[PDB]
């Protein structure tokens, strides 16, 4: 039952083993009912750490090959592909889960932004790995999802909201890092920081220390981008 699987997933939150955490929440979602916000983060963090391990691993094996350039590198090449072929499966299972079960039954403001932003991220993570033609197809999709969430959010969410700023932070990073449009990314973040701080008191005790963290994330990105 759903209530049981939530506990069986928070047992892998503590004591890690996130591959088990994914299995519990994945089955929870397939029931078709809308997830509670607390139950929504568990599916977010369950996959945030499964991919985050291969993302970090892929980068290191990438820097090694760029530095060796050679039978050593001929083998180090096939090992980088091994990590890539895993990132593909992890991303596909989230997207199919988002497309087939979560998004269709969202039926609420905050939920719609959450799932589309998430759909945006897991397409971006494929861009960092895919080749030219596949990158373009993937790059466009990450933008439609990002843009679609970018539309609903600005219409309905408060001036300050962790999901609101979190989409601006991730959308700008998509421009700066994937589309190589530093000024296109700079303006997006700059306004988000300005709008949020202009009305900072709209936050409240339950989330102000959560949203304020993202504001430091936005400001630091601009400082690095201005240099």
């Amino acid at each position: 039952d759903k209530n049981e699987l939530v506990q069986k997933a928070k047992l892998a939150e503590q004591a890690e083993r996130y591959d088990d955490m994914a299995a519990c929440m994945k089955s929870v979602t397939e029931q078709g009912a809308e997830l509670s916000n607390e139950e929504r983060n568990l599916l977010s963090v369950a996959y945030k750490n499964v991919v985050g391990a291969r993302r970090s691993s892929w980068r290191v094996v990438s820097s090694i090959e760029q530095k060796t350039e050679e039978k050593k590198q001929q083998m180090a090449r096939e090992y980088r592909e091994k990590i890539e072929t895993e990132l593909r499966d992890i991303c596909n299972d989230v997207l199919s889960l988002l497309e087939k079960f979560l998004i269709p039954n969202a039926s609420q403001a905050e939920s719609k932004v959450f799932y589309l932003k998430m759909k945006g991220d897991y397409y971006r993570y494929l861009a960092e790995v895919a080749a030219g033609d596949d990158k373009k197809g993937i790059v466009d999709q990450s933008q439609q999802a990002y843009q679609e969430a970018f539309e609903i959010s600005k219409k309905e969410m408060q001036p300050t909201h962790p999901i609101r700023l979190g989409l601006a932070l991730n959308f700008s990073v998509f421009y700066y890092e994937i589309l190589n449009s530093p000024e296109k990314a700079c303006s997006l973040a700059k306004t988000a920081f300005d709008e949020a701080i202009a009305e900072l008191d709209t936050l409240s005790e339950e989330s102000y220390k959560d949203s304020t963290l993202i504001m430091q994330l936005l400001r630091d990105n601009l400082t690095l981008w201005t240099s």
């Binding site: 890690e16 980068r59 290191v60 820097s63 994330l217 630091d220 690095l224 981008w225």
Partner: protein
């Protein structure tokens, strides 16, 4: 701060008490670490104990007079002068002032030679011999690349961030050995650091232990202790990361691409009190953590997870 559960392989040392750490928390913003026991007393100005086990593992010296060719005076100070020379190849000579020492001074020199012939760490300047007949001198290896002080101020601009950190890594990896031999290097400074070939660092001026313009590198308490050497290493970091000279030093001057893990490391070494400072076995450990994280967490900042720990 926002923390998370973390289990550490390789090595780590809790930033509060600095004992070996295997399973604890850490802060995602700055990488701070700590045990659960000391979590209740971790500072918040963000700017049933158990046993630990085994962790993972990775007379003929003298030179007769006249054999050594003497070149041009490169520099002088303290109680001697430095010359380039040739003896079985290129060499360097520290000509001490005295030519006719008293037996007590000579015996002090004899003991120093007894010590200096034992130290053979890669990141210290190789010892090649001594001479008493013409004058008190010690013969070492000659490093073509001038002192690190010369590579920041005269010829400069040739240091990437990864190479910039690696120099402070070999500086500590060489001064850890000088503490594992119980020798306090009193006068560490960027002019006492040399670069031989393909940038292999070498430390000097630690000799003359028995007998034993520097204002910038002198510690505030300078007066001598292991803690005093840590501050001197802290000042060397400032010159590297900032690319300038000191003058507290302004940490804001650092480059943009140097991560905050190095920002906090430098801040500890420059701590006013002796006690709060770390020791080189740990400094050499964090800097190798800070070095494993360059090819891994180079990025433009993404979105972090909400706080998943409370204390």
């Amino acid at each position: 701060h926002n923390f998370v559960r973390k289990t550490f392989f390789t090595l780590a040392f809790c930033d509060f008490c600095r004992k070996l750490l295997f399973q604890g928390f850490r802060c995602q913003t700055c990488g701070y670490k700590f045990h659960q026991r000391c979590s209740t007393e971790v500072p918040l100005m963000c700017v049933r104990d158990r046993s630990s086990s085994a962790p993972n593992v990775h007379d003929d010296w003298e030179i007769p007079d006249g054999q050594i060719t003497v070149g041009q005076r490169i520099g002088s100070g303290s109680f001697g002068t430095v010359y380039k020379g040739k003896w079985h190849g290129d060499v360097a000579v520290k000509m001490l002032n005295v030519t006719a020492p008293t037996p007590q001074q000579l015996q002090a020199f004899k003991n120093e030679v007894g010590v200096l012939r034992k130290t053979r760490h890669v990141n210290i300047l190789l010892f090649m011999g001594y001479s008493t007949k013409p004058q008190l001198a010690i013969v070492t290896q000659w490093c073509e690349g001038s002192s690190l002080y010369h590579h920041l101020h005269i010829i400069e601009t040739k240091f990437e961030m990864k190479k910039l950190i690696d120099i402070a890594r070999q500086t500590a990896q060489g001064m850890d050995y000088l503490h594992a031999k119980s020798i306090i290097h009193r006068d560490l400074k960027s002019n006492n650091i040399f670069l031989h070939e393909d940038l292999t660092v070498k430390i000097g001026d630690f000799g003359l232990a028995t007998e034993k313009g520097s204002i910038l590198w002198m510690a505030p308490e300078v007066p001598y202790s292991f803690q005093s050497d840590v501050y001197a290493f802290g000042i060397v970091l400032y010159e590297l990361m900032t690319g300038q000279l000191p003058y507290s030093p302004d940490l804001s001057k650092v480059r943009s691409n140097c991560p905050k893990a190095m920002k906090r490391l430098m801040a500890e070494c420059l701590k006013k009190k002796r006690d709060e400072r770390p020791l080189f076995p740990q400094i050499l450990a964090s800097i190798e953590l800070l070095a494993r994280s360059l090819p891994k967490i180079h990025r433009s900042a993404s979105e972090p997870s909400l706080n998943r720990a409370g204390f």
